Design a protein around this nucleic acid. Structure first.
Ligand SMILES: [Mg+2]
Ligand SMILES: [Mg+2]
Ligand SMILES: [Mg+2]
Ligand SMILES: [Mg+2]
Ligand SMILES: [Mg+2]
Ligand SMILES: [Mg+2]
Ligand SMILES: [Mg+2]
Ligand SMILES: [Mg+2]
Ligand SMILES: [Mg+2]
Ligand SMILES: [Mg+2]
Ligand SMILES: [Mg+2]
Ligand SMILES: [Mg+2]
Ligand SMILES: [Mg+2]
Ligand SMILES: [Mg+2]
Ligand SMILES: [Mg+2]
Ligand SMILES: [Mg+2]
Ligand SMILES: [Mg+2]
Ligand SMILES: [Mg+2]
Ligand SMILES: [Mg+2]
Ligand SMILES: [Mg+2]
Ligand SMILES: [Mg+2]
Ligand SMILES: [Mg+2]
Ligand SMILES: [Mg+2]
Ligand SMILES: [Mg+2]
Length: 73
RNA sequence: CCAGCCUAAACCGUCCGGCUUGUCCGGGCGGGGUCGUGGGGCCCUCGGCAACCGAAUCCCCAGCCUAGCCGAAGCUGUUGGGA
């Protein structure tokens, strides 16, 4: 069972991270407690989004602060 | 006997719901697509088509079905209860 978890669990790993688990642990616990989600191709593709989103957002907030330093120095 | 066809998916637009604004997550609608010389999508170059095909869908008609109608040519005698 592949599931991207939405919470840092000492068991599995950190948020957003994808990891393998026994189906039971997922179907009967992680899933209902919302702690994690199915690594479905649909959701997985949407996870590639948040990465690119903030990979841009950060590589631009900092990218803009590259000119401010380019003048005060 | 005779005959071949429509979609799902990639792709684009829209509507509603969702987030952490992304050619992004889902749902419905429309466009796109449909085959084994493998085909389609998206990009570059040629018509930027009159045309050529065309129904298993509609519309009119013929025909046919459910009543009908026209239709040739004979008389006499005889037996017999009756020709
Ligand atoms: Mg489908
Ligand atoms: Mg598509
Ligand atoms: Mg669109
Ligand atoms: Mg859509
Ligand atoms: Mg709607
Ligand atoms: Mg909305
Ligand atoms: Mg959409
Ligand atoms: Mg469609
Ligand atoms: Mg078509
Ligand atoms: Mg079509
Ligand atoms: Mg084809
Ligand atoms: Mg080219
Ligand atoms: Mg052209
Ligand atoms: Mg052309
Ligand atoms: Mg023209
Ligand atoms: Mg006729
Ligand atoms: Mg007939
Ligand atoms: Mg009749
Ligand atoms: Mg008569
Ligand atoms: Mg008669
Ligand atoms: Mg006599
Ligand atoms: Mg007689
Ligand atoms: Mg007599
Ligand atoms: Mg007689």
């Amino acid at each position: 069972m592949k599931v991207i978890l939405l919470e840092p669990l000492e068991n599995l790993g950190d948020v957003g991270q994808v990891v393998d688990v026994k189906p039971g642990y997922a179907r009967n616990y992680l899933l209902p407690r919302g702690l994690a989600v199915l690594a479905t191709e649909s959701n997985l593709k949407a996870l590639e989004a948040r990465i690119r989103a903030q990979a841009k957002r950060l590589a631009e907030r900092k990218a803009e602060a590259e000119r401010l330093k380019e003048i005060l120095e």
